[PDB]
């Protein structure tokens, strides 16, 4: 589990592992999509969902 | 795989006497691609991983 609560502020780069499931539980759309890499430093493929 | 494959010879516009020098292909690389996979990274390389 992970939490944003004042403060905080959690962006934690997290392996793919090959598939994952997920699940949000938010008010007012706190979370607007995601972004899958593998280098994500100028030298590979990345995608953006928003 | 499910499908048909082709292949035409194209010597006419595809070469001629001095050469032509635009093409590549990767023969080094730490793993090999798994299918329809594609890498388009050009880096310096060493056997040491480094
Ligand atoms: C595609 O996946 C392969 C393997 O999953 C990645 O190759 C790994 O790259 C890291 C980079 O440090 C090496 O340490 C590993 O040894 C490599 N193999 C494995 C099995 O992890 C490759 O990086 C991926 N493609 C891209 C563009 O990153
Ligand atoms: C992605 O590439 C760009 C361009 O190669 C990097 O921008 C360079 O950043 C360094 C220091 O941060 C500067 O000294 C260079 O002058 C920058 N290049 C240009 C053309 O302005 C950028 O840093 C790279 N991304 C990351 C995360 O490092
Ligand atoms: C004014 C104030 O302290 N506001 C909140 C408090 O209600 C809460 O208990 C705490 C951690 O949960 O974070 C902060």
New interface residues.
Partial sequence: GFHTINHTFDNPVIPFKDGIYFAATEKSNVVRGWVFGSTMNN???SVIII | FMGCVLAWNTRNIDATSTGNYNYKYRYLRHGKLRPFE????N?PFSPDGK
């Fill in positions: 030298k590979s493929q | 594609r890498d388009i990274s880096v």
